[PDB]
Structure formats: C-alpha cells, structure tokens
Design a protein around this ligand. Structure first.
Ligand SMILES: Nc1ncnc2c1ncn2[C@@H]1O[C@H](COP(=O)(O)OP(=O)(O)OP(O)(O)=S)[C@@H](O)[C@H]1O
Ligand SMILES: Nc1ncnc2c1ncn2[C@@H]1O[C@H](COP(=O)(O)OP(=O)(O)OP(O)(O)=S)[C@@H](O)[C@H]1O
Ligand SMILES: Nc1ncnc2c1ncn2[C@@H]1O[C@H](COP(=O)(O)OP(=O)(O)OP(O)(O)=S)[C@@H](O)[C@H]1O
Ligand SMILES: [Mg+2]
Ligand SMILES: [Mg+2]
Ligand SMILES: [Mg+2]
Lengths: 312, 316, 304, 256
C-alpha cells in the first residue's frame, strides 16, 4: 500500500534529524528574512528535498504554493533557464508580496552553459526570487554558480541518530525485528534513511520478519560467510582447486567479480597480514578492478585475483 | 534587503582591482588615452574580468554609459538573429562621444555563444571599428572561434596569489569590523583557491552565520575534508604505514566525502608539503594516476586504498 | 523464423526444467520480477511464455535493453511513454551493466510508475544490481540444463529439421559452446545452411564457434616450452594469418594453463600476464604485439 | 437547473474573445445572483474577473450553485458558430457534465444546438484585497487600445504616469523612446469621448505590454475603459458590460 518512505516523512522542520546545526541556521534565516540562495549537496536519502519542502511550507501557505514555488527537476533537460525559470523569476505574482522560491532538484545534471545562464539569472533577480539548488556531487557544479550561494553538506546519518527513528517506526508499525536485524539493516542502508526504511518495509512485506539473514536474502547482498569461504579458498588451497571452488560459488549464487573484490578488500583490511603483504594484495586488487572496468573476460580476471593472493 | 558584500564592495575604478598588475596597467593606459581595441579578457573565475571591463567602459565613456554601452549576458538571447539585428543596429547607431571615445559592446560569457552567432559577429566587429569597440569576457578562451580571436587582443588573466586575496579581505574586514583570527583567514584563503569572489562569499556567509571568524568555523560552512586529516594521512604514507593511513582514509569515506573531493584535497595538500623533492614527485605521479582512474569512473574505496598502497611502497 | 524462437516454450509449466520459478510465475498477478543466470538458459523465453499466458496472443509488452548507447535518460523516457490485465510488462535485459547512478534513476522511474507497469530485470549477476532494485524485485535463478539434456534437445531439433549430424557432432556442438543452449541451437541452425544438409562435420562447428583448434594451442605451448624467440614469432604469425582472434587464443590459453600441472608460481605469473593482455586487447591494442609479449612471458616462465 | 437566456449573444461571444487568449480554462462559478469568473493567467501576473448580473439576462434561472470548469478556447470555438444577432440559451443540467448552448435565430427557421463537454477544474478563489486607488483615468476604449498597440511597437514596458493635467504613457526601446500624453477634456461633447482623470496623488508605474494588449481585446464590450491604479498595487482595467456587469483585469507592476 502506502510506502513507509512517505508515511513517516518529517512534516515540520524540527522532525528532521542529524542536521541540527544546518536546520537551526536555516530557521534563523527564515525568521530574519535573510534567506540566501541555498545549495544543498550530499549523498542520497539524507533529507534535502524534505528540508527545503518543510522550509517552504513554513514560508508560504498551501494555496500560495502553486504560484510562488517552482519545483523543477534539472534532469529532464540552456532553454530551461531562459524559458520557465527566467519567466518565473522576473515576474511578480499579482497580489502576493514577498520573494519566490525556485527548487532545482538534481542541479548537477546541468550542462556548464546552462549553469552560466542560471548564474546570471540568479545574480540579476536576487530580491524577488530565491534559488535552492540540490545536488549529490558539488564537484559537478561550476565554481562560478556555487560561489553565488551558501553551501550545505548533508552528509550521511550516523547509525546512533538514525536508530531511534527506526525504533519509532517499528513500534508504531508491527515489525518483529531482531537485535541484529536492526544492525544488518543499518549496515546495508549505509546511512540514507530512505534506503533503510525501503529495505525494512520490503523485507517485512515479503518474508514477514526481519533478521540478519532475511535482509541479506531480500537484498541479495553477498553474505559475510561466503566471502570468508572465498578468502579461505584463495589463502589455504591449491591454485586450481581454488579456481574451481570460487567459480562454482560464483555461479551458484548470482555473484559478479566487482562485489567479490569489494568484500575481499574489506576482509584484507580486517584479517591480520604482515602489513607488507597487504600492500601487494591492495595494489593487485586495485588493478583488477580497473581491468574489469573496461569490459574484459571475468574468467581471466578471477584467475588474476587468485594469482594476487598466491603471494602467500 | 541588504545586498551582499560581493557587490557592496565591488571596485568602481581600475585602481582598486588587485588581480593582475600588468593587464590592469594596460587597461588603465587605455582608460587614459582612450582608443581601446576589441579585447577578449580570458581567465579563471572570480578574478575580476567583468569588473575590469565594466570599470574600463565607465572610465572611457563617463556619463554616456547609458547611451554608448550595450551589455549582453549569457541570460540574454544571443542567437544569430540577435547578433544580426540588435548588435548590428547598435553598431550602426550614431552616438557623439569625445575625440577618442567609442561605443562599447560588452559580450559577457563570450564562450557561451554558438558558432553561428560568432560568425555573424565577425564582420560587425570589423566594419564599424571606427565607432564601435567590443569587449568580450570568457573563461575557456578556446570556445571562441578563431576568426573572432583574430580581431581581438586576447588579454590573459591568472589566479590570484594568497597575498592579494588577503589584502582585499583585510580592506573589507576593516570596513565591516568583523572579529577574525589568523587561522580563520588562512582557512578562507585555503578554501578560496584564488577566486576572489569565493573568498568574499565565504567571509560573508561565515560572519552572518556565526560572527567570529576562526578555522573551526570556516570549515563549518565550507565543510571539505579538513586539510589536517589529509596531511596526517600523507604523513603516515611517507613512513610506509599503510594500516594507519587507511585508517584516516576510511574515516573520510565514512563521512561521505566523494572521492573526487578526497583526491582534490590530497593533491592540493601533497603539492605544498614538506617531504623530499624526488619523493614528492613520486607521490604526485601516483596521485595523478589515481585521479585519472577516478575521473574515468572507477571511484570505489578500493582505488583509494590501492593509491595508498602505491604511495607506501614507493618508500619501500 | 529462427530456431532460437521456433522452439521456445509456449507455456510456463511446460518444458522449463526450473520448477521454483514456474510455480511462482502463476501467482505473479515483490511487485516486480528479477531473473538472473548464465546466458542462454531461458531467461527471456520464460517471461515471454508467462506474458503470452497472462495477456494473450493479440495482447502484445515493451522489451528493451538497459545497455543502450543513448544513455539512461532515453530508457526511462521510453518507459514513461509506454506506461500510457490491469498493467503492462517492460523487460530490461543486461540490467547488470547499468552503473549505480543509472540504476538510481531507473529506481526513481520505476517507483514513480509503480501503479501501471510491472518490471522484469534480466541479468547474469544479481550482485551487480543495487539493493533498492533487488529489494523491490523477486529473484529467480536460472540454472543451465544438464549436459545430457542439452544433447537430447539438440537431437530432437536435428530430427525435427532433418539435419544429419553425428552424435559425436552433437557432443562437440554442446562442448564448443559450453552450457549455452541458445548458442548451441543457433550454431546448429547456422551450420546447416553452410552445408545444404549434406553433412555437418565437427570442422564446420569449430569454424562457426570461432574456437581455435586445440592443435594450434598445443603448438603455441610447444614453441614457448623451449625455443628461441624466432619460433614464437613464427607461431604467432601463423596464428594471426589463420584469422583466429586474440581473445580466443587468450581464453583457451588460460583454460589450458589453469587446469594443468604447472607450478603455482608459474600459473600465477602466466595468468597475471593473461589478464593484462586481455585488458590490452580490450583497449584496442594490436593483437600481434600483445601475443608476442604474452608468448615471451610464457616462454621465460616455462623455459627456465 | 442553470437556464439563462441572453437576447444578444454578441455580448457572450465578445466576452469569450476577451478571455480566450489570456486564460486557457476557467471555472464559471454560476450562482442564483449571477455569473462570476475569477481566474489568473498561466504566468500568475494578471487576474481577470468577470461578473454578469442576473438582471441583464431575459430569463435567468439557477436553483443550485454550479462550478462549470469550461475550456475557454473550445467554448469560444463553439460560440463562433452562433450568429451575431442570435438569442443564446445556456443550459446546464443539475449535474450532467455538459453545457448546452442553444443558438436560436432572430425569429427565423434556424436553431443550433451544441453540447460543450465540460472538464473538472480545481476551483480556487484567491482573495482580491479591496484597496483605494490614487488615480482613476476614464478614457475612450479606442484610445487606450491604440495607445497600447502603438507603444508596443517601441518597447515592451509602458510607464503610466498620472499627473493632474493629464496622463502620459511612455515607452523606450532599441529604436528610441516615445511618450503619448493625454490631457483631460474640459468640453465633453460626448460623455464617451471624454478623458476624466480623478487624481488624488501623482503616480508612476511600469507594466508589461503583452498583458495590456491582452486586456485591450475587450474593447468591443464597452466604449469607455477605466484605468484605476495606485502605487505598489496592481493596475485595474475595467470594461463595463452594459447594464449586465463588468470585466475587470488586474495586472501586477514590472520589477525595475
Ligand atoms: N533527516 C531525516 N529525518 C527524517 N526523515 C528523513 C531524513 N532524511 C531522510 N528521511 C526520510 O527519507 C526519505 C527520503 O529523503 P529525501 O529528503 O527525499 O532524500 P533526498 O536528499 O531527496 O535524496 P535524493 O533527492 O535522491 S539526493 C524521506 O521521505 C524521509 O522519510
Ligand atoms: N581582482 C579583483 N579585485 C577586487 N575585487 C575583485 C577582484 N576580482 C573579483 N573581485 C570581487 O568579486 C566580485 C565579482 O568579480 P567579477 O568581476 O564578477 O569576476 P568575474 O571575472 O566576472 O568572474 P566570472 O564572471 O564568474 S568568470 C566583484 O564585485 C569584486 O567585489
Ligand atoms: N530451461 C529451458 N527450458 C526451455 N527452453 C529452454 C531452456 N533453456 C534454454 N531454452 C531454449 O533456449 C533458447 C534460448 O533461451 P533464452 O531465453 O533466449 O536465453 P537468454 O536468457 O535470452 O540468453 P541471453 O538473452 O543471450 S542473456 C530458447 O529458444 C529455448 O527454447
Ligand atoms: Mg530528493
Ligand atoms: Mg563575469
Ligand atoms: Mg534473453
């Protein structure tokens, strides 16, 4: 039915979590009519399009929200700048007094010429239309454009902050969550509340109970024991019987070499090596990843990885 | 509604531009004698190109600036039809100016004009040069087709040294009486990277958000990987200590800094570092290789760890 | 019509040897579907059978591949256009070759359109698909058919189409395209046009499958075993003048190096060089020079 | 149900041709006291408000309130089929989602029936803040249409200025500047032809000209137009539809 990523949206500005400094500064901006152009950037699912929407609903009303807020996605399309944006920023709204708000979601998919045009539009109409850009890679935004507006990095949510909200969601709903299912959910989410709530809802709706095994099977994430097995084949076996074992496991479950390689890197850093061997393992694994990035055979790259581990 | 400091303290005459003493000296000569050629000012952002062209046009024309100057931004329609109608009718328009003065057609962001527009602008530049002078500005001076550069003096602009940004920042601080400290000013100069408009924007944003200016506070509004952590990571990599450098690397990765940002800061810090010389060059080589591999799209933590392993094994 | 489609399954519980996928596909009325498995194991055939069962012969499903050259935006745009039996089925083939940023966008497109269109992601690796797409989908592994079944079905095809092929010919046909029933059937089809039905010997299969004969591989190892650089130059020149691609030589050379009695150090070195040469060839390097280099490494490894 | 008989459908046709190009689709709010239409254009810069009282119609019968969100383009396309002197009967059944326009003839042997398909519009009635204007110019509609259509040739921004001795409309553009100044007539031969400037404080404002040209397409409705305005308040162009109501365009000033 209704997804939990929408039912538990923070409707106000204080229901946001883990960004108390940024939220307090934006609230102070609102109180003093000093709201500058904002550039909210960071990893997905961290609360950007919710922060600015709460700020808007606090700033305008619900009927002024169609004629004084231009929610525009930048991934649909230089014409979008001199088109609707320049025609929205330059004109007043008839009876309403106050600035307007333009919300450019995915503001980093814009070509550089479009960002030049938009920077001039911003610079011109800066007292009747406040722009709020939203992106994931501030490096993709022209330094010129970013200079114009104050920047806010919405980093990922630490697991201490985000666990109470998940506990409130669990208690409000009826989810029999284990003491580690929460841990295997926080880990797999990797710090974006959207993915955490989505995974939780989908697994609870598919299997009926969340634990450290059910979430790992619902998301198809390679289990830790399997990667331990692969590292053991590589580290304590013959070359050919390791190739055979690893290939059989890699085809048994759906498993590529990118994921094997990532988890094996984490394990190389986990387990104890003479610290002059992991310099070799790390170098070779970072070369195998580049080799795989160009569309090569995985039957020769897997063998190269086993060769890398055969320094032992 | 008070306007930002980027504009409240915009220099209104070329004696106040701190950018590039030689080029601004040439432009003061032109503002004195008065017969400017079509000039293309090219350079990195934030360094005072638009300001220089505006101050030059003002000092040339004077009170006829409303009548003799035509500015066309990137936010204005500048297709082939506008170049063939509006710019041409302005070049042909009669304005009576003093002996050596000419009308000025400022095409800001000249690298944003399509090729057809510049082709249509060539002969307008060439014919009416007896009464009309063009002053283009751009960042990528190769986006301007060659026949347009052939009829313009290509004035190059360069990034600002840290001393110039510091002088202008102190001139602004004196007028605003903002409480500061040396570490805060060094933080602003580090986050600016030459852009004199970035520095002012960071100064105003920091002062308006918090007041007092200290590095701890500067890195609370800019918020890029603290250069002390990157210095510590490079130091661990100098002592061939991989397990202690990957510590800092995974710490930075935990806070969600994109690997492009991590590499940018690692490069900018390893360039002005305190290693040997040959070792510094051997480090910068590997950092450049990994930057290539990350810009290409292989941006996983494994590539950063491989870079750390190479940096370690350079020093045995 | 080609034999790869003439002999596709027409129903769900009909011929598909996989049982736990054909049972759930009856209740498919977990909103989406996610099939993964080795190529040529009835991935698309099964969903097409399910769609011909559900919708009907005249009710005719947009099938497109997510590995397009035209970026990801045109893919999701086409999905939106197709969006407007209370739903329609869109198939995404090669859905693992999408970068994570392109799957994030396909995720938004498929979750904003989660009311009228059902999705089916077909891939060879479920680990390459990110956790949102898999978490929204229901997985189904497709394991290849057993070797004996392969030969059985191929004989059935060769008797339904009257293609006189030896039984050892069928064994070699399934051996030359390992566990790839689609590839084996396509080879059987395109290898009878090459003869007009007179006789299809294993040489025709070896030519169509692009497999360099095992004699040339044994010659390469005989040269690099002990000999001057002139022998390597000669054998590589003869192997290139024959037309055999360097990818196939690298592939088969690796297959021989791995499962033989070379030392672990030698196998490690030779396989590292094989991987480097494979990337070099994939980057457009010249086959003659890469083969010369690989043979020089193999020679200095074996001769010592 | 909604049953209204208009003796001269020319009025309805001119209204639809005045609203056709400013707003695409509007919510005709039918009531027992009259007909209203308040809506702002797609750019939210101008707000048209039409009112047609009940007494202007011959037999206006409305028992329950209605909100017929007609598509104005299609409605005008249908109204074009009517004659110039036809009697027009609008009939909206209690709830049928169709509006029957019946174009009778001027007592002849032709009757036309049209069933315009309505569409559901999300009605919104924004408050029009009642305000006191500092200048009220009353001028022959032909002159205002001419002034706007002329200054549109020069610039896209008309600067309207109310002094006491006359109102002047200025404009400036690439080909120079031009300003048309009208003085209030003292010997009004025809009360239509007069230009009466009720001035309480000298004002000066700037307005776009696309929208003033959109307003001046209602000139066949009335001979006199009333430009009422004050500082920092949207100008009000009023055309009085004779003895049956009015058509009032609001326009927000121009920035800079
Ligand atoms: N700080 C937060 N407090 C409460 N809920 C949050 C927070 N961050 C994320 N969420 C939840 O996660 C959902 C998605 O968050 P969004 O603000 O949409 O993330 P996002 O920054 O827009 O991600 P993008 O747009 O793909 S970069 C919301 O519906 C919330 O329920
Ligand atoms: N050299 C300089 N000396 C003094 N102030 C400067 C200088 N460069 C920039 N500024 C300040 O920065 C503001 C903006 O600089 P601009 O002249 O806009 O630079 P710019 O070359 O136009 O940068 P672009 O157009 O984004 S590439 C000015 O209003 C000044 O206050
Ligand atoms: N388990 C099976 N049951 C029935 N027919 C099968 C089976 N496996 C393979 N086939 C046959 O093999 C042919 C190919 O199956 P496909 O579904 O096209 O494989 P595939 O998944 O498309 O491989 P790709 O597209 O190259 S990744 C079909 O014509 C089927 O008749
Ligand atoms: Mg968002
Ligand atoms: Mg500029
Ligand atoms: Mg298929």
């Amino acid at each position: 039915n209704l997804p939990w990523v929408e039912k538990y949206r923070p409707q106000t500005l204080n229901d946001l979590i883990s960004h108390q400094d940024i939220l307090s500064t934006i609230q102070k901006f609102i109180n003093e009519d000093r709201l500058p152009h904002l550039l909210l950037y960071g990893p997905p699912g961290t609360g950007k399009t919710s922060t600015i929407l709460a700020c808007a609903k606090q700033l305008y009303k619900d009927k002024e929200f169609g004629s004084m807020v231009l929610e525009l996605n930048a991934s649909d399309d230089i014409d979008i700048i001199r088109g609707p944006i320049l025609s929205f920023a330059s004109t007043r709204t008839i009876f309403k007094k106050g600035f307007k708000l333009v919300i450019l979601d995915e503001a980093d998919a814009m070509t550089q010429d479009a960002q030049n045009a938009l920077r001039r539009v911003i610079e011109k109409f800066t007292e009747n239309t406040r722009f709020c850009l939203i992106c994931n890679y501030l490096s993709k935004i022209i330094p010129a454009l970013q200079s114009r507006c104050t920047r806010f990095r919405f980093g990922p949510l630490t697991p201490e902050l985000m666990v109470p909200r998940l506990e409130h969601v669990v208690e409000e709903e009826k989810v029999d969550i284990s003491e580690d299912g929460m841990k295997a959910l926080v880990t797999l989410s990797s710090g974006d509340m959207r993915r955490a709530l989505n995974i939780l809802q989908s697994t609870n709706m598919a299997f009926g109970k969340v634990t450290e095994e059910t979430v790992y099977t619902c998301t198809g994430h390679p289990l830790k024991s399997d990667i331990a097995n692969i590292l053991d084949w590589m580290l304590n076996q013959d070359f050919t019987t390791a190739y055979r074992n690893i290939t059989e496991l890699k085809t048994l479950k759906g498993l590529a070499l990118h994921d094997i390689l990532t988890e094996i890197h984490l394990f190389v850093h986990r387990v104890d090596f003479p610290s002059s061997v992991r310099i070799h393992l790390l170098t070779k694994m970072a070369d195998i990843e580049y080799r795989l990035s160009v569309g090569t055979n995985e039957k020769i790259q897997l063998s190269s990885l086993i060769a890398a581990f055969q320094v032992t | 509604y008070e306007l930002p400091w980027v504009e409240k303290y915009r220099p209104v005459k070329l004696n106040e531009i701190v950018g590039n003493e030689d080029t601004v000296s040439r432009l003061e000569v032109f503002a004195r004698e008065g017969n400017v050629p079509n000039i293309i000012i090219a350079g990195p952002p934030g360094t005072g190109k638009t300001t220089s062209i505006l101050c030059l046009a003002r000092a040339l024309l004077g009170p006829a600036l409303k009548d003799a100057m035509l500015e066309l931004n990137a936010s204005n329609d500048r297709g082939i039809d506008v170049v063939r109608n509006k710019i041409k009718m302005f070049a042909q328009q009669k304005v009576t100016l003093p002996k050596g003065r000419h009308k000025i057609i400022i095409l800001d962001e000249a690298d944003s004009m399509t090729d057809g527009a510049q082709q249509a602008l060539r002969r307008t530049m060439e014919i009416y040069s007896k009464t009309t002078r063009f002053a283009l500005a751009c960042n990528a001076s190769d986006k301007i087709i060659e026949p347009i550069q052939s009829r313009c003096a290509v004035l190059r602009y360069t990034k600002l040294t840290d001393a110039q940004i510091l002088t202008r920042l102190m001139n602004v601080i004196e007028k605003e009486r903002v409480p500061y400290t040396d570490d805060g000013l060094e933080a602003i100069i580090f986050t600016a990277q030459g852009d004199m408009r970035q520095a002012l924007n960071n100064l105003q944003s920091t002062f308006s958000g918090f007041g007092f200016i200290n590095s701890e506070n500067v890195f609370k509004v800019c918020d890029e990987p603290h250069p002390l952590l990157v210095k510590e990571m490079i130091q661990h990599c100098v002592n061939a200590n991989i397990d202690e450098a990957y510590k800092i690397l995974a710490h930075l990765w935990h806070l969600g800094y994109s690997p492009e940002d991590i590499i940018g800061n690692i490069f900018r810090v390893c360039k002005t570092f305190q290693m040997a010389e040959y070792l510094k060059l051997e480090f910068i080589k590997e950092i450049g290789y990994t930057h290539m591999k990350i810009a290409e799209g292989v941006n996983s933590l494994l590539q950063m760890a491989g870079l750390l392993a190479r940096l370690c094994q350079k020093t045995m | 019509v080609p034999w790869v489609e003439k002999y596709r399954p027409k129903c769900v519980d009909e011929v598909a040897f996989q049982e736990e996928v054909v049972a759930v596909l009856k209740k498919s009325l977990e909103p989406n579907l996610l099939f993964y498995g080795p190529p040529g194991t009835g991935k698309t055939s099964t969903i097409l059978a399910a769609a011909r069962e559900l919708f009907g012969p005249e009710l005719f499903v947009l099938e497109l591949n997510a590995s397009d050259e035209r970026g990801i935006q045109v893919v999701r745009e086409k999905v939106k256009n197709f969006a407007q039996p209370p739903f329609k089925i869109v198939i995404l083939d090669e859905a693992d070759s999408m970068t994570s940023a392109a799957q994030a966008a396909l995720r938004r497109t498929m979750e904003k359109e989660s009311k009228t269109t059902r999705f089916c992601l077909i891939c060879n690796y479920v680990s390459r698909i990110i956790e949102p797409l898999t978490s929204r989908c229901s997985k189904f592994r497709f394991k290849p058919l057993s070797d004996k079944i392969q030969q059985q079905r191929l004989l059935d095809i060769a008797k339904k189409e009257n293609v006189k092929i030896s039984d050892e010919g069928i064994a070699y046909l399934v051996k030359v395209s390992e566990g790839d029933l689609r590839k084996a059937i396509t080879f059987l089809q395109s290898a009878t046009r090459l003869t007009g039905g007179k006789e299809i010997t294993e040489k025709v299969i070896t030519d169509i499958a692009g497999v360099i004969p095992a004699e040339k591989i044994d010659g390469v190892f005989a040269a690099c075993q002990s000999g001057s650089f002139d022998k390597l130059e000669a054998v590589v020149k003869d192997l290139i003048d024959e037309g055999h691609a360097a990818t196939q030589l690298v592939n088969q050379l690796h297959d021989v190096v791995v499962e033989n009695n070379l030392s672990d150090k030698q196998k490690s070195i030779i396989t590292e060089k094989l991987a480097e040469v494979d990337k070099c060839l994939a980057d457009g390097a010249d086959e003659h020079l890469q083969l010369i280099s690989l043979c020089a490494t193999v020679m200095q490894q074996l001769s010592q | 149900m909604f049953e209204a008989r208009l003796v001269q459908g020319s009025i309805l046709k001119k209204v639809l041709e005045a609203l056709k190009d400013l707003i695409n689709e509007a919510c005709w709010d039918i009531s027992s006291s009259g007909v209203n239409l308040q809506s702002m254009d797609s750019s939210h810069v101008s707000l048209v408000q039409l009112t047609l009282r009940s007494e202007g119609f011959d037999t206006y019968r409305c028992d329950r309130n209605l909100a017929m969100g007609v598509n104005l383009t299609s409605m005008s396309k249908i109204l074009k089929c009517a004659g110039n002197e036809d009697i027009i009967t609008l009939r909206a059944e209690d709830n049928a989602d169709t509006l029957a326009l019946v174009f009778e003839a001027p007592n002849q042997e032709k009757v036309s029936d049209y069933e315009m398909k309505l569409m559901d519009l999300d009605v919104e009635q924004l408050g029009i803040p009642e305000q006191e204007y500092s200048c009220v110019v009353k001028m022959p509609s032909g002159e205002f249409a001419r002034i706007c259509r002329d200054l549109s040739h020069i610039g896209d921004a008309v600067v309207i200025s109310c002094a006491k001795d006359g109102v002047k409309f200025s404009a400036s553009g690439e080909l120079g500047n031009g300003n048309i100044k009208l003085s209030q007539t003292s010997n009004v031969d025809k009360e239509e032809e007069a230009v009466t400037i009720e001035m309480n404080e000298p004002v000066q404002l700037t307005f776009a000209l696309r929208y003033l040209n959109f307003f001046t397409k209602a000139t066949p409705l009335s001979s006199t137009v009333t430009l009422s305005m004050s500082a920092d308040v949207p100008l009000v162009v009023e055309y009085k539809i004779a003895d049956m109501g009015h058509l009032k365009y609001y326009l927000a000033p121009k920035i800079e």
